[PDB]
Structure 1
């Protein structure tokens, strides 16, 4: 159903196509243990207190 190799006046078959999708991992991001804290400024502070 398509042109052959090395000739234009003959025919050949395509018979589909294979694919190679890379490997992606999502275990840690799927754990959902990180809590989103959206903020406005470009730098956030924090003060640490520890009683003796």
Structure 2
């Protein structure tokens, strides 16, 4: 199926491959907590008000 290890005139089959995908975590972006608030400016302001 495939040429050998150290000779070009002999054969040795290649039985697939194995992959090692890294570990990616979620469960924080998974929860629908952080709802997006797109804007146009480089900085944004907020108003803080309170009473008693």
TM-score, normalisation: structure 2: 0.89
**Could you say what secondary structure the match of 2:28 adopts?**
helix
Which consecutive aligned stretches of 4+ in structure 1 deviate over 2 angstroms post-superposition?
A: none
Give 1:41 shift: 0.8
Between the two proteins, the alignment pairs up a number of residues equal to 52
Q: As a proportion of its length, which structure holds more helix? A: 1
1:1-52 superposed Cα distances (whole Å, 9 cap, x missing partner): 1100110110001011111011111100000101111111111111211224
Gaps of 5+ in 2: none
CA RMSD of aligned residues (A): 1.0
TM-score, normalisation: structure 1: 0.89
